[PDB]
Design an enzyme around this catalytic site. Sequence first.
Site, PDB file in Angstrom:
ATOM      1  N   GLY A  49    -117.999  -9.739  66.286  1.00 52.50           N
ATOM      2  CA  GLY A  49    -116.991  -9.912  65.257  1.00 52.50           C
ATOM      3  C   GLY A  49    -116.055  -8.750  65.000  1.00 52.50           C
ATOM      4  N   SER A  50    -115.506  -8.726  63.789  1.00 48.31           N
ATOM      5  CA  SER A  50    -114.596  -7.673  63.364  1.00 48.31           C
ATOM      6  C   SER A  50    -115.130  -7.079  62.067  1.00 48.31           C
ATOM      7  CB  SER A  50    -113.194  -8.245  63.134  1.00 48.31           C
ATOM      8  OG  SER A  50    -113.219  -9.263  62.148  1.00 48.31           O
ATOM      9  N   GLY A  73    -117.404 -15.214  64.318  1.00 49.87           N
ATOM     10  CA  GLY A  73    -117.369 -15.927  63.055  1.00 49.87           C
ATOM     11  C   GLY A  73    -116.461 -17.148  63.119  1.00 49.87           C
ATOM     12  N   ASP A 107    -109.470  -3.192  60.532  1.00 50.27           N
ATOM     13  CA  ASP A 107    -108.686  -2.575  59.472  1.00 50.27           C
ATOM     14  C   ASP A 107    -109.438  -1.402  58.861  1.00 50.27           C
ATOM     15  OD1 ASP A 107    -110.229  -3.612  56.936  1.00 50.27           O
ATOM     16  OD2 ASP A 107    -109.915  -5.407  58.161  1.00 50.27           O
ATOM     17  N   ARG A 163    -119.061 -30.412  61.964  1.00 42.96           N
ATOM     18  CA  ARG A 163    -118.363 -29.572  60.986  1.00 42.96           C
ATOM     19  C   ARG A 163    -117.336 -28.661  61.664  1.00 42.96           C
ATOM     20  NH1 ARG A 163    -120.744 -28.865  55.784  1.00 42.96           N
ATOM     21  NH2 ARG A 163    -122.471 -30.337  55.469  1.00 42.96           N
ATOM     22  N   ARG A 197    -104.834  -4.669  70.432  1.00 39.88           N
ATOM     23  CA  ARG A 197    -105.952  -5.218  69.662  1.00 39.88           C
ATOM     24  C   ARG A 197    -106.697  -6.266  70.487  1.00 39.88           C
ATOM     25  NH1 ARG A 197    -101.990  -4.944  65.744  1.00 39.88           N
ATOM     26  NH2 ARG A 197    -101.447  -7.164  65.943  1.00 39.88           N
ATOM     27  N   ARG A 233    -123.971 -11.179  67.863  1.00 40.62           N
ATOM     28  CA  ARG A 233    -122.810 -11.486  67.049  1.00 40.62           C
ATOM     29  C   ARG A 233    -121.672 -10.606  67.536  1.00 40.62           C
ATOM     30  NH1 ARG A 233    -119.291 -11.691  63.179  1.00 40.62           N
ATOM     31  NH2 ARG A 233    -118.833  -9.827  61.909  1.00 40.62           N
ATOM     32  N   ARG A 282    -112.548 -18.962  68.050  1.00 38.82           N
ATOM     33  CA  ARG A 282    -112.754 -17.797  68.898  1.00 38.82           C
ATOM     34  C   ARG A 282    -113.819 -18.125  69.945  1.00 38.82           C
ATOM     35  NH1 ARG A 282    -108.365 -14.529  68.105  1.00 38.82           N
ATOM     36  NH2 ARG A 282    -108.353 -14.445  70.395  1.00 38.82           N
ATOM     37  N   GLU A 334    -118.663  -5.815  57.165  1.00 40.93           N
ATOM     38  CA  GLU A 334    -118.505  -7.195  57.604  1.00 40.93           C
ATOM     39  C   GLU A 334    -119.321  -8.110  56.691  1.00 40.93           C
ATOM     40  OE1 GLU A 334    -122.087  -7.218  58.346  1.00 40.93           O
ATOM     41  OE2 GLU A 334    -121.579  -8.472  60.084  1.00 40.93           O
ATOM     42  N   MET A 335    -119.665  -9.315  57.144  1.00 39.11           N
ATOM     43  CA  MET A 335    -120.385 -10.238  56.266  1.00 39.11           C
ATOM     44  C   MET A 335    -121.581 -11.015  56.825  1.00 39.11           C
ATOM     45  SD  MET A 335    -117.001 -11.831  54.304  1.00 39.11           S
ATOM     46  CE  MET A 335    -117.882 -12.929  53.177  1.00 39.11           C
ATOM     47  N   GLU A 336    -122.144 -10.607  57.959  1.00 42.00           N
ATOM     48  CA  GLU A 336    -123.254 -11.383  58.518  1.00 42.00           C
ATOM     49  C   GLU A 336    -124.468 -10.639  59.083  1.00 42.00           C
ATOM     50  OE1 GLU A 336    -119.385 -13.530  58.586  1.00 42.00           O
ATOM     51  OE2 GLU A 336    -120.009 -11.799  59.779  1.00 42.00           O
TER      52      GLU A 336
HETATM   53  N1  LIG Z   1    -112.730  -5.491  55.776  1.00 40.31           N
HETATM   54  C1  LIG Z   1    -113.569  -6.505  55.893  1.00 40.31           C
HETATM   55  N2  LIG Z   1    -114.367  -6.815  54.848  1.00 40.31           N
HETATM   56  C2  LIG Z   1    -115.216  -7.842  54.969  1.00 40.31           C
HETATM   57  F1  LIG Z   1    -115.942  -8.060  53.906  1.00 40.31           F
HETATM   58  N3  LIG Z   1    -115.386  -8.643  56.040  1.00 40.31           N
HETATM   59  C3  LIG Z   1    -114.565  -8.304  57.085  1.00 40.31           C
HETATM   60  C4  LIG Z   1    -113.650  -7.266  57.080  1.00 40.31           C
HETATM   61  N4  LIG Z   1    -112.975  -7.188  58.291  1.00 40.31           N
HETATM   62  C5  LIG Z   1    -113.504  -8.170  58.975  1.00 40.31           C
HETATM   63  N5  LIG Z   1    -114.461  -8.908  58.362  1.00 40.31           N
HETATM   64  C6  LIG Z   1    -115.177 -10.076  58.988  1.00 40.31           C
HETATM   65  O1  LIG Z   1    -114.291 -11.194  59.046  1.00 40.31           O
HETATM   66  C7  LIG Z   1    -114.682 -12.212  58.067  1.00 40.31           C
HETATM   67  C8  LIG Z   1    -113.929 -12.111  56.732  1.00 40.31           C
HETATM   68  O2  LIG Z   1    -112.497 -12.219  56.891  1.00 40.31           O
HETATM   69  C9  LIG Z   1    -116.217 -12.092  57.971  1.00 40.31           C
HETATM   70  O3  LIG Z   1    -116.797 -12.933  58.961  1.00 40.31           O
HETATM   71  C10 LIG Z   1    -116.487 -10.591  58.291  1.00 40.31           C
HETATM   72  O4  LIG Z   1    -117.710 -10.326  59.033  1.00 40.31           O
HETATM   73  N1  LIG Z   2    -131.175 -29.689  51.117  1.00 37.17           N
HETATM   74  C1  LIG Z   2    -130.096 -28.934  51.056  1.00 37.17           C
HETATM   75  N2  LIG Z   2    -130.245 -27.619  50.802  1.00 37.17           N
HETATM   76  C2  LIG Z   2    -129.148 -26.844  50.737  1.00 37.17           C
HETATM   77  F1  LIG Z   2    -129.398 -25.591  50.491  1.00 37.17           F
HETATM   78  N3  LIG Z   2    -127.866 -27.220  50.897  1.00 37.17           N
HETATM   79  C3  LIG Z   2    -127.740 -28.564  51.155  1.00 37.17           C
HETATM   80  C4  LIG Z   2    -128.792 -29.465  51.247  1.00 37.17           C
HETATM   81  N4  LIG Z   2    -128.327 -30.745  51.518  1.00 37.17           N
HETATM   82  C5  LIG Z   2    -127.023 -30.572  51.578  1.00 37.17           C
HETATM   83  N5  LIG Z   2    -126.554 -29.312  51.376  1.00 37.17           N
HETATM   84  C6  LIG Z   2    -125.090 -28.898  51.399  1.00 37.17           C
HETATM   85  O1  LIG Z   2    -124.592 -29.118  52.708  1.00 37.17           O
HETATM   86  C7  LIG Z   2    -124.555 -27.871  53.444  1.00 37.17           C
HETATM   87  C8  LIG Z   2    -125.837 -27.611  54.246  1.00 37.17           C
HETATM   88  O2  LIG Z   2    -126.104 -28.675  55.188  1.00 37.17           O
HETATM   89  C9  LIG Z   2    -124.199 -26.804  52.389  1.00 37.17           C
HETATM   90  O3  LIG Z   2    -122.791 -26.677  52.296  1.00 37.17           O
HETATM   91  C10 LIG Z   2    -124.817 -27.381  51.089  1.00 37.17           C
HETATM   92  O4  LIG Z   2    -124.028 -27.157  49.877  1.00 37.17           O
END
Ligand SMILES: Nc1nc(F)nc2c1ncn2[C@@H]1O[C@H](CO)[C@@H](O)[C@H]1O
Ligand SMILES: Nc1nc(F)nc2c1ncn2[C@@H]1O[C@H](CO)[C@@H](O)[C@H]1O
Lengths: 237, 237, 237, 237, 237, 237
Positions: free
Chosen positions: F89-90, F20, F204, F43, F217, F87, F24, F179-181
């Site tokens: 991650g953590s 993520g 954690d 970016r 870790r 992917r 890293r 996690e989130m992805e």
């Molecule tokens: N306890 C946690 N809860 C959530 F929601 N996401 C977690 C956690 N630990 C690690 N992650 C991962 O690291 C990022 C958010 O810090 C995200 O990229 C996510 O995948």
């Molecule tokens: N056509 C587009 N559709 C969507 F969904 N997001 C857009 C677009 N153009 C720019 N953005 C903004 O810039 C990022 C994605 O390149 C995102 O951070 C987003 O807010």
Amino acid sequence: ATPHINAEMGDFADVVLMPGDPLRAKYIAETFLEDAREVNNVRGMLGFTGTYKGRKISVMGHGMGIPSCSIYTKELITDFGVKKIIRVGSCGAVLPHVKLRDVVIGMGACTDSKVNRIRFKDHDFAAIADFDMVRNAVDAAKALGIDARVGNLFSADLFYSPDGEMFDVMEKYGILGVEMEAAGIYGVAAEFGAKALTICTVSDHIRTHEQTTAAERQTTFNDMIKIALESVLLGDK
Amino acid sequence: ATPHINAEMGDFADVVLMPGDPLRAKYIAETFLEDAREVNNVRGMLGFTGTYKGRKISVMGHGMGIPSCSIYTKELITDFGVKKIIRVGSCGAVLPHVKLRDVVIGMGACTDSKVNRIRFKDHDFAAIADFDMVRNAVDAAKALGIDARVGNLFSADLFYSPDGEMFDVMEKYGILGVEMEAAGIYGVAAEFGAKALTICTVSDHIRTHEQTTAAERQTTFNDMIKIALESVLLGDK
Amino acid sequence: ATPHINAEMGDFADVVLMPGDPLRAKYIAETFLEDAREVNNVRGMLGFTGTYKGRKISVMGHGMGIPSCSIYTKELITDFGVKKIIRVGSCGAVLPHVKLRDVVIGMGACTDSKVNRIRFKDHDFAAIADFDMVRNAVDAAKALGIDARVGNLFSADLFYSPDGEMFDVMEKYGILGVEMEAAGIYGVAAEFGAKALTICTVSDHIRTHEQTTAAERQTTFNDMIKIALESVLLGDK
Amino acid sequence: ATPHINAEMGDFADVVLMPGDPLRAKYIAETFLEDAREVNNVRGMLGFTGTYKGRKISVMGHGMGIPSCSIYTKELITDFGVKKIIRVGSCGAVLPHVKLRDVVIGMGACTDSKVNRIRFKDHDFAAIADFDMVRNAVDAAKALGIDARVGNLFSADLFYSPDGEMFDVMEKYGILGVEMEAAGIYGVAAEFGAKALTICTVSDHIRTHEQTTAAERQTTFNDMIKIALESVLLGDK
Amino acid sequence: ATPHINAEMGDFADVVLMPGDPLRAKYIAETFLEDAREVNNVRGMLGFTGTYKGRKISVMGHGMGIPSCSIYTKELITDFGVKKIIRVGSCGAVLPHVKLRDVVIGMGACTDSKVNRIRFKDHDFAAIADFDMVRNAVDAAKALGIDARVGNLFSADLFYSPDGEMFDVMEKYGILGVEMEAAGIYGVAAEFGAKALTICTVSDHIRTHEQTTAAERQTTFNDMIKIALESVLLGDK
Amino acid sequence: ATPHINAEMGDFADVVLMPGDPLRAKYIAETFLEDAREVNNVRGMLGFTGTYKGRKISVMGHGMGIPSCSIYTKELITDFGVKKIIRVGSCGAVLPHVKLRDVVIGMGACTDSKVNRIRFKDHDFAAIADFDMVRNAVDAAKALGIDARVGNLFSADLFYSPDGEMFDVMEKYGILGVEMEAAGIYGVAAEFGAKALTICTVSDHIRTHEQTTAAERQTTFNDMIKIALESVLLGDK
Ligand SMILES: Nc1nc(F)nc2c1ncn2[C@@H]1O[C@H](CO)[C@@H](O)[C@H]1O
Ligand SMILES: Nc1nc(F)nc2c1ncn2[C@@H]1O[C@H](CO)[C@@H](O)[C@H]1O
Ligand SMILES: Nc1nc(F)nc2c1ncn2[C@@H]1O[C@H](CO)[C@@H](O)[C@H]1O
Ligand SMILES: Nc1nc(F)nc2c1ncn2[C@@H]1O[C@H](CO)[C@@H](O)[C@H]1O
Ligand SMILES: Nc1nc(F)nc2c1ncn2[C@@H]1O[C@H](CO)[C@@H](O)[C@H]1O
Ligand SMILES: Nc1nc(F)nc2c1ncn2[C@@H]1O[C@H](CO)[C@@H](O)[C@H]1O
């Protein structure tokens, strides 16, 4: 009294007929009730109380839409001791064999409103009428020589729907008429423990768009009211 | 004439104030407009057209609930050339620092209705008012020396809600007033191409239960009317 | 022959009684029908056709759950000309006044399944029985000196639901019995244009287990079948 | 320090401008702020604090998507005393009368995300910006002689949408720009008690496919930055 | 004894094979198990327990549909100490490269049922099989010289769905076969802490009907059972 | 090149490891890859390409959240010819027996995001990994003497959830890590026909809140990467 009804316990009969149009309520009181008196005028939603063949009966408008009729029906049941609610309105037809001036009785009512899902934990609550009331109305209609279809109505939130797609769907599943209150009233009846029924006359069709002759439409409307009033007497027995 | 309004193009001004109560519309017409003439009476939903400081203006009720007001606002926009709709209603407060008779301006309107999800492919449509109209209202209030908060309103389908816990959620997210039409009028304005704004007077408090009488709601909410009318003049310039 | 019924048009009567337990099909044929013949055996779902007081009748099980009964009812209607389906089953009660062995008739059926939303564009479809069939069952029961309640049934997808909080909701809205098929059969009837009815006997009272003898159950079950069969004859008149 | 920001209370100003791109934040800090110092680098999400016309101000990226920006905005509000957040991003246009480099102000933000339904009991929460902040931005633009439209934005979860038909719906309802964070920032501001506003520069057109280069988006969108910074000064007065 | 299984703890092995067709239970016991004994007959759902190469194994049908299989799998797990459930059934294919008689293993199962949303607070629960069981089935098939595909299954609530547009979607996302139980069994396994796996043989290729001989089907079915049984032994190592 | 990746076909290997944190990615390239070169910087989302034991491999960050990683994974697959995404991650643990530094492999991923419902016509799509990739990773882990749990992950939209109620629910249903992805990447893989896998190390726990010793870790994190890289070689065979 409540913010919507300036009356007191006793002012309404334990049975109330309800048209959507408040002006239709005055018409009903004047035409079928004896010794009637106006019991509400707040927001212009006229209510009246009188007697039919010696029976104490009330009639009051409920406005258009589930949210509107939900307010009035709830208050009548919890604040005025009303036991039965009979909605008397009009509906649009979608089925090819349901013609203008047909009298429809909604034993059930479908809807695109979210009110019953909010009540029923997001599940499917079948909004139905009280069986005995449906039976009394079917019987009263026979006695008057009138044919009446019993089935599902569809209570719409939008009279001017953005997607006329639901009409084919309603027709597909047998809905008899389209109106805007039945499902809401049935939801209130169930929530506060009362009995309700919706009777409608077909005012227009989805396919063919042609009326008849005012005199004929007005005759059918009165037949619906007679069915409603006579169904109450049958139930009293 | 339209299905619910018996008038012809030209009878209504290009701007219409709309309270939920037909009787409040009548009062507004008699108290604030000159040479006021009644233009609609169908279903008792009184509509009037007169002049304010020489400016042609109309005022007509819309009934209670999203389904009811959706019908009237749509017809005005598509068949009577109405460009702006300013709702002037009442609402219930949920926040502790809000008191009866306070004026609120809904820049946005939350809702538990399904009408906007039906229009927006089941996604979240942010029902918002026209920015210029909001600014006009704020400026008019300052000029009149009347306080007014700008924020979110919550348009409910059920006046008598099955779950009061939702009031805690509304409060947490800073909802200024609970009414039953805003989100619906905004959805209609966007769908049919017009502009709208909702101004409300707190008529009751959901937590303390302090209430204003129906008579009071019908003929004593003058501040919001003054802001509405003066905001239109500001818009014309 | 269809995927789940190895028979040809004409093998089934236009009226079919359906228990959930397949073993009950043979019992009903032997006990109540004359000159019965076997017409299906696929997957062990035994079907029979015979006569009751001269009237041609068929009986075959439907299996537990909406998905199972949906298959059988659909094939019977579209491929074997079946016009009426009568489910004869059992249910659990949540209301205090509804007692063990009571006979309940589902004029409507609530549900937590998604089948009807899939059919009704994610809106609320009121799954209802055919009114005449309901009235026939009520009259037949009366003639047999049996009292029956007419109301809403709840068709559950999970016999073992993760949270019993819903049973409180069911009780609040007047649900008479909890079973697992009615809402599904009613949906099929509406989709393919046929008629249906569900009659159930209370076999358990959730949150209140009483006692019954195998002989008492035998009696009540036979009562339900006689009510169903006599109801058909009434419908023919 | 918080889980995603290695800084201490006082390092950030009470107002923070936030672009989705960390590199744009760096450019803003080097081009518009005096005595700019880097205060965060965790995960590469650069944050800076400097001064504009003597006014202490911060600028930090928030990443792409509602989940990403929800994390950063929450931490700033709860642990760094941030009172106002002004998002300065890019967006795609859907309307024909909107061209590249046009500036848009989101008074509201629609979305197909589930985050607000999770916060608002599955109802419609109208994600709106702070009125005063919107007015400040409009005034600042007029003073700078820069055009800017005020309206609804649409915050998408999928940049590459599975159904382009939704673009037709967005267009019909007048959505000014498609981006991916607005509705999320507004939901966070309301939940944690702060104020927010989103200003965007059209970087591409969804229908014509005309595009701006990544380099351009990173270091050439100056108009929105000028409006943002000047709008803050207006707010201070 | 449970409501649907008249047996006692110890009557079933800790591993149970389950076909949809109850008639297949006796066939499997006689053809593949040694010293088999009958352990259930309630509602006609015949259950048997015996040994395969010394390993204790049980076999019993589950019925069609998620609701039916949910009852049996739950009772086996909570009342009879069952640790592994292996569904051995049939399915219809939508992918071109998936041919009749192919053996597919569902590592995961999509669905249109609402059972898992009811369990997972209306969020998305990925109904998956136990990984080791999946790997065991794959290795057992390989050892038998049989090629098997591992992927997503789709568990439908309606064998006859109102719109076939979903089959196109299923094909686009790689669904290997369409059946009616996997997602339900996986949900039960997760809820009560057990392990499950669904293996299916393609019996039809929706939108493309080919041909097979009763002898070919016999062979393929026997292949699936041998794969299931040998997979268990692998899991014990 | 795209607006998010300034590279050309050939610049990335057909296998990409994705953490993520973009910082890293540089750490991974520097530590395990030979003759590596930076191929993207837009970016600040750094991407690198080099070789591992003679095998061409790429590594690039994907940002936090489903919306963010959905953009990068989609572009790699459709614009850069990538076949496999891993992917790395953590995650946070909810189960009592899953301890810190445990290596988790997500064969499936639950989620509260709406992205897969939008893809799958509002039904339940089981977001799963590619079976062979899961098997290769489990095998590589054994070879390294590491224990790895295979199961469900939960991909959250809100790191700071308004209702900590889902944690008990996740634990109830056996989720191994939060996690989130994962769910988003699996959705993209299925939509555009590629293969993906998510591997995480427990950073954690929900219950006990106690770390260990940085050195430990960091050792576990490297083990995860070695498992990832070595799983690719196994797959090449
Ligand atoms: N306890 C946690 N809860 C959530 F929601 N996401 C977690 C956690 N630990 C690690 N992650 C991962 O690291 C990022 C958010 O810090 C995200 O990229 C996510 O995948
Ligand atoms: N056509 C587009 N559709 C969507 F969904 N997001 C857009 C677009 N153009 C720019 N953005 C903004 O810039 C990022 C994605 O390149 C995102 O951070 C987003 O807010
Ligand atoms: N075709 C129709 N469609 C809808 F939606 N409602 C209809 C129709 N015909 C009559 N009604 C009834 O009259 C009022 C709306 O004019 C509402 O009160 C409603 O019940
Ligand atoms: N507490 C309240 N709750 C709701 F739902 N609506 C309220 C409240 N107070 C006033 N209103 C407004 O007045 C009418 C209902 O009396 C409706 O037209 C509505 O807009
Ligand atoms: N208490 C009960 N709860 C549920 F959900 N279903 C019940 C109950 N009692 C009987 N049934 C009926 O018998 C079968 C399930 O055992 C199904 O066929 C069902 O219709
Ligand atoms: N094409 C098919 N579609 C569906 F929905 N289910 C199928 C199909 N082929 C076989 N099955 C399996 O057999 C039974 C339904 O006949 C159910 O038990 C089911 O798992």
